[PDB]
Design a protein around this ligand. Structure first.
Ligand SMILES: *[C@@H]1O[C@H](CO)[C@@H](O[C@@H]2O[C@H](CO)[C@@H](O[C@@H]3O[C@H](CO)[C@@H](O)[C@H](O)[C@@H]3O)[C@H](O)[C@H]2NC(C)=O)[C@H](O)[C@H]1NC(C)=O
Ligand SMILES: *[C@@H]1O[C@H](CO)[C@@H](O[C@@H]2O[C@H](CO)[C@@H](O[C@@H]3O[C@H](CO)[C@@H](O)[C@H](O)[C@@H]3O)[C@H](O)[C@H]2NC(C)=O)[C@H](O)[C@H]1NC(C)=O
Ligand SMILES: *[C@@H]1O[C@H](CO)[C@@H](O[C@@H]2O[C@H](CO)[C@@H](O[C@@H]3O[C@H](CO)[C@@H](O)[C@H](O)[C@@H]3O)[C@H](O)[C@H]2NC(C)=O)[C@H](O)[C@H]1NC(C)=O
Ligand SMILES: *[C@@H]1O[C@H](CO)[C@@H](O[C@@H]2O[C@H](CO)[C@@H](O[C@@H]3O[C@H](CO)[C@@H](O)[C@H](O)[C@@H]3O)[C@H](O)[C@H]2NC(C)=O)[C@H](O)[C@H]1NC(C)=O
Ligand SMILES: *[C@@H]1O[C@H](CO)[C@@H](O[C@@H]2O[C@H](CO)[C@@H](O)[C@H](O)[C@H]2NC(C)=O)[C@H](O)[C@H]1NC(C)=O
Ligand SMILES: *[C@@H]1O[C@H](CO)[C@@H](O)[C@H](O)[C@H]1NC(C)=O
Ligand SMILES: *[C@@H]1O[C@H](CO)[C@@H](O)[C@H](O)[C@H]1NC(C)=O
Ligand SMILES: *[C@@H]1O[C@H](CO)[C@@H](O)[C@H](O)[C@H]1NC(C)=O
Ligand SMILES: *[C@@H]1O[C@H](CO)[C@@H](O)[C@H](O)[C@H]1NC(C)=O
Lengths: 230, 324, 180
């Protein structure tokens, strides 16, 4: 119930964050603005003279004899052709940038939406749980749902527990102490458990391991047998 | 990670201290404005790239005053407090090895340093700030493993961090604990070997020297182009105005304007292409920083040959060096 | 001084200084690696003079935004504030507009000379970037200030040989990534 409530709260906050902030979608608005600016610049270049007496071809043809009119027109042709060639080159560079972004978006969709990525900070901040796509003009928006640890407490730890001269290591977890008793807990969420022969494995004697501490590992089978046989 | 930032004033380059040439240049429209926007966009992109690669940590982490990490010696990785700028020995070596640029920043001040209207801009982050980000990343990794990357930093003894990294690759914890001294000795030896390899190999940093050399070549070529006539009687505008009456000066000046404008468009085009290549490299560096410094990557050969355990970033001029 | 010179038939604008170049009796003029004239022999007295171009650079305007305040700061990129101050007193700068340039509002940055902003020692997160670690912002009577930007808050880790921090709770977070 807590997780469902936190998820719903986070989604509502996302909607409010996008609505409230005018710059939230700047990445896509910049693409739109650059394409509009490129076309407006390309059109405005037609007004320039490029050294000609006039930017209007009909004025050149009406004012000069064919020879000079052809020279002035060729000059305007050079100017307009250079402007278009520049436009196309800039569009090729922008298209390459967009291609790289689109390839990243497709990778993000495959790794984050169609699976649970292990990659750090690839699918948002925190430990990745899941993601959801949303469409947008000229692009895609990903909502990355992650697990973020909170409210940590520090405990005393040890690499191993020594019982009858044997070194016990966690199978899946870390040994922690609250100051009086040693427990095994999972690393990403405090949940103390009794240290038993099912939770740990044994390798070697209690000498080589640096920082090994003395404690009792509770074997369940022996405890039952001492009741069974009496 | 980043490229030298430049800003070129179109009018001074093409028509320096020439009113008549500037008036003629005005007849070509927005071209000067488009080049100014292109170079500004490149400069902003280079600062974005540096921030994305290095400014990945919200807080500045510090190591404890007692630098005992289970026998693992990080003295060659962590900041050396006795030197100005607080760089680590390896970062200091990298700085001494590849800083062959003509300063690379304004510094409140080619023999002429391309003062033909070409201005090099300083990075937004100083070398000290980049070193500080690297130090924060190192302190976080050393003292908290990957918990630092995902959320708040959680302290863990270093040999237990190694034990969990061993479980990550697929080796049990007892292998590390039984061989902890051997592992620490091999780590310290490898770090010493890296310092010796970088010191003794001039070509080790070739990627960054090549980036610097390409930007120096582009600026040298752009300045060199001013000496060409492009069909004009003289490459110097003052000689054209002092020698010819306006009606002929306009022709000779127009020829020079065409040549210089073509030179600037060629320069800007190559800088845009190089900017795209550098942005791709910076994106890869940021990805590696997230995947391998803030976590333990499982991608084969992504961060070194062998089974990945961890990585440590080091700052370098215009780039990042990872020790995997 | 920055002057317009004409030595025989070579004209230009620049600063003439006493040279330290070992000209032979043969050479009359000097050029650098990019074929720009940088030294001349004075037709009279045969003094060798070096030519330094007159200082120039870009101009940046730092604006809090006109919906907040109309005060702006001006960065003179590429030059030492001593030369800008001298040019102001001599009325030599190409732009004809001026900034108040009162005491304490002229600050030397690596990027250039910043006029119209008060530098403070307290560090803040970067707002309007200037360069080389220096950013500007509009803060309190509000005025434009300059500062060395903060990178983040400090957080020492309580590292020890046998201390581990274990989360006891968690947050489910949703973040937004926007890609073209
Ligand atoms: C460290 O953790 C252990 C176990 O979680 C703590 O010991 C436990 O403390 C609780 C305190 O409420 C004990 O509960 C009490 O047990 C007695 C009978 O033993 C009962 O009469 C009381 O009404 C209450 O239920 C619990 O038994 C005890 N368990 C053991 C094995 O000692 C310990 O106090 C913790 N220490 C610190 C410093 O946090
Ligand atoms: C961590 O590693 C560094 C080196 O990577 C250790 O510092 C090094 O300590 C040795 C100790 O002998 C220094 O040796 C010196 O050699 C010169 C002759 O070459 C001699 O004149 C000196 O009296 C000294 O014997 C070595 O220079 C020094 N290196 C550096 C860069 O400081 C450091 O002690 C190691 N930390 C631990 C805790 O072991
Ligand atoms: C696994 O490989 C490591 C090396 O990668 C072995 O450790 C190495 O063991 C040799 C001895 O077999 C050591 O050589 C000795 O070094 C001492 C140094 O004082 C020297 O006095 C001796 O004469 C001899 O040269 C070597 O230093 C040591 N290397 C390290 C880094 O500790 C290890 O024994 C191998 N284990 C197995 C089970 O094969
Ligand atoms: C772990 O953290 C979560 C929060 O992220 C804790 O749940 C939160 O507990 C507080 C009470 O300590 C709740 O505040 C209360 O909300 C009710 C709503 O009607 C209000 O009437 C109360 O006056 C008070 O404000 C909070 O709502 C609740 N959050 C959620 C999402 O349920 C949780 O208890 C923590 N668990 C541990 C073991 O620390
Ligand atoms: C764990 O218990 C063992 C005993 O089972 C301790 O070993 C003894 O250590 C003392 C010194 O501390 C020696 O004088 C004894 O001779 C040792 N006896 C044996 C049988 O080894 C061991 O020191 C304990 N460890 C800790 C950390 O308390
Ligand atoms: C960690 O250790 C003890 C509590 O066990 C305390 O002195 C210290 O302040 C704790 N620090 C943090 C950050 O929990
Ligand atoms: C800037 O001018 C001051 C004026 O005294 C001088 O001391 C300083 O060295 C100059 N810096 C540079 C880089 O020219
Ligand atoms: C003549 O030439 C010499 C050397 O060039 C110079 O010192 C002297 O002043 C000149 N006399 C004039 C210009 O009357
Ligand atoms: C960790 O153990 C070493 C053993 O030499 C000791 O010097 C160091 O002080 C210990 N760390 C702490 C925080 O006590």
């Amino acid at each position: 119930k807590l997780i469902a409530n936190q998820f719903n709260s986070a989604i509502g906050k996302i909607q409010d964050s996008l609505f409230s902030t005018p710059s939230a979608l700047g990445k896509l608005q910049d693409v739109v603005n650059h394409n509009a600016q490129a076309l407006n610049t390309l059109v405005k270049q037609l007004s320039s003279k490029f050294g000609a007496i006039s930017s209007v071809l009909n004025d050149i043809l009406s004012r000069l004899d064919p020879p000079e009119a052809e020279v002035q027109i060729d000059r305007l042709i050079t100017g307009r052709l250079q402007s278009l060639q520049t436009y196309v080159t800039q569009q090729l560079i922008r298209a390459a940038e967009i291609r790289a972004s689109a390839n990243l978006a497709a990778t993000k969709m495959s790794e984050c939406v169609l699976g649970q990525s292990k990659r750090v900070d690839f699918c948002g901040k925190g430990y990745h749980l899941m993601s959801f796509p949303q469409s947008a003009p000229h692009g895609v928006v990903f909502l990355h749902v992650t697990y973020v640890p909170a409210q940590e407490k520090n405990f005393t730890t040890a690499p191993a527990i020594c019982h009858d001269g044997k070194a016990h290591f966690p199978r899946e977890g870390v040994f922690v102490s609250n100051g009086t008793h040693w427990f095994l807990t999972q690393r990403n969420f405090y949940e103390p458990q009794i240290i038993t022969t099912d939770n740990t494995f044994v390798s070697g004697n209690c000498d080589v391991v640096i920082g090994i501490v003395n404690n009792t590992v509770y074997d369940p089978l022996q405890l039952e047998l001492d009741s069974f046989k009496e | 990670v980043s490229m030298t930032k430049t800003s070129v004033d179109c009018t001074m380059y093409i028509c320096g201290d020439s009113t008549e040439c500037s008036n003629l240049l005005l007849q070509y429209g927005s071209f000067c404005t488009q080049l100014k926007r292109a170079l500004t966009g490149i400069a902003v992109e280079q600062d974005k790239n540096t921030q994305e690669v290095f400014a990945q940590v919200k807080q500045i982490y510090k190591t404890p005053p007692i630098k005992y990490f289970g026998g693992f010696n990080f003295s060659q990785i962590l900041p050396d407090p006795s030197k100005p700028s607080k760089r680590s020995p390896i970062e200091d070596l990298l700085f001494n090895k590849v800083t062959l640029a003509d300063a690379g920043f304004i510094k409140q001040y080619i023999c002429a340093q391309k003062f033909n209207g070409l201005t090099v801009l300083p990075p937004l982050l100083t070398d000290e700030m980049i070193a500080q980000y690297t130090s924060a990343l190192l302190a976080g990794t050393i003292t908290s493993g990957w918990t630092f990357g995902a959320g708040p930093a959680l302290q863990i003894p270093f040999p237990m961090q190694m034990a969990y990294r061993f479980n990550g690759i697929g080796v049990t914890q007892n292998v590390l604990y039984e061989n902890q001294k051997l592992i620490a000795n091999q780590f310290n030896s490898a770090i010493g070997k890296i310092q010796d390899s970088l010191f003794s190999t001039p070509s080790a940093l070739g990627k960054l020297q090549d980036v610097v050399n390409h930007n120096a070549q582009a600026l040298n070529t752009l300045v060199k182009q001013l000496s060409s006539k492009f069909g004009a009687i003289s490459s110097v505008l003052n000689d054209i105005l002092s020698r010819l009456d306006p009606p002929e000066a306009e022709v000779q000046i127009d020829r020079l304007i065409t040549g210089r404008l073509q030179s600037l468009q060629t320069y800007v085009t190559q800088q845009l292409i190089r900017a795209a290549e550098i942005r791709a490299s910076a994106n890869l560096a940021a990805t590696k920083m997230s995947e391998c410094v803030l976590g333990q990557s499982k991608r084969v050969d992504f961060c070194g040959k062998g089974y990945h355990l961890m990585s440590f970033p080091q700052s370098a001029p215009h780039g990042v060096v990872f020790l995997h | 001084k920055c002057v317009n010179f004409n030595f025989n038939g070579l004209t230009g604008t620049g600063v003439l200084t006493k040279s330290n170049k070992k000209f032979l009796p043969f050479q009359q003029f000097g050029r650098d690696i990019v074929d720009t004239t940088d030294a001349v022999r004075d037709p009279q007295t045969l003094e060798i003079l070096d030519i330094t171009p007159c200082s120039f650079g870009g101009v940046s305007v730092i604006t809090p935004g006109t919906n907040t305040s109309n005060q702006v700061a001006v960065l003179y990129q590429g030059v030492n504030c001593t030369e800008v101050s001298v040019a102001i007193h001599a009325d030599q700068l190409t732009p004809t507009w001026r900034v108040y340039s009162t005491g304490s509002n002229v600050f030397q940055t690596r990027a250039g000379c910043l006029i119209g902003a008060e530098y403070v020692n307290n560090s803040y997160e970067c707002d309007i970037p200037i360069g080389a670690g220096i950013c500007a912002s509009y803060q309190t009577s509000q005025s434009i200030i300059a500062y060395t930007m903060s990178l983040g808050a400090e957080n020492s880790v309580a590292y020890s040989n046998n201390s581990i921090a274990i989360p006891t709770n968690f947050t489910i977070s949703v973040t937004t990534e926007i890609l073209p």
